[PDB]
Nucleic acid binder design. Structure first.
Length: 46
DNA sequence: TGTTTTTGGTAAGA
DNA sequence: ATCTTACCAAAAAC
């Protein structure tokens, strides 16, 4: 239905970014997606 | 004009 | 203020 905002490629690039200690809140402004989307794909339990 | 799927503002948090 | 999370109305898509 609705196209995702982040494809499996980013799901890895972003994951890496966050693994290097990157702020989801910033990792969102820049990319374009909202913070809830990001926390949903990358729980703080990640 | 209608169903699906995923988004995102947002309130809420022993 | 700051960080997390699940909602759930609805944008996006056909």
């Amino acid at each position: 239905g609705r196209p995702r905002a982040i494809n499996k490629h980013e799901q890895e690039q972003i994951s890496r970014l966050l693994e290097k200690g990157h702020p989801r809140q910033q990792l969102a402004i820049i990319f374009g997606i909202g913070v809830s989307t990001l926390y949903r794909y990358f729980p703080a339990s990640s």
